[PDB]
Amino acid sequence: CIAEDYGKCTWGGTKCCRGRPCRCSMIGTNCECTP
């Protein structure tokens, strides 16, 4: 899973471990996982 900080993720693909919301750049491209 993505247990890294701000680790790149995908809406519907690899989600953040534990279940953390993934933020994006308001453009729906490089979404990083936020602790």
Domain segments of the chain: what residues?
1-35
Quick one: how far is CA 34 from the chain centroid?
A: 7
d(CA 17, CA 14): 9
- Give, in words, the CATH class of 1-35: few secondary structures
The two beta strands, 22-23 and 32-33, are antiparallel
24: left (phi over 0), alpha (psi -120 to 50) or beta: beta
Please give the torsion angle defined by the CA atoms of residues 8, 10, 13 and 16, in that order, rounded to the nearest 10 degrees: 50
For residue 23, the SS3 value is strand
Those residues with Cβ within 8 angstroms of residue 16's Cβ, 6 or more apart along the chain or in another chain: 1, 2, 3, 7, 9, 22, 33
- Tell me how the structure was determined: NMR
- The enclosing H or E element of 22 equals strand 22-23
Cβ atoms of 2 and 15 closer than 8 Å: yes
Burial (CB count <10 Å: 0-12, 13-18, 19+), residue 9: buried
Round to whole Å and give the CA distance between 35 and 9. 13
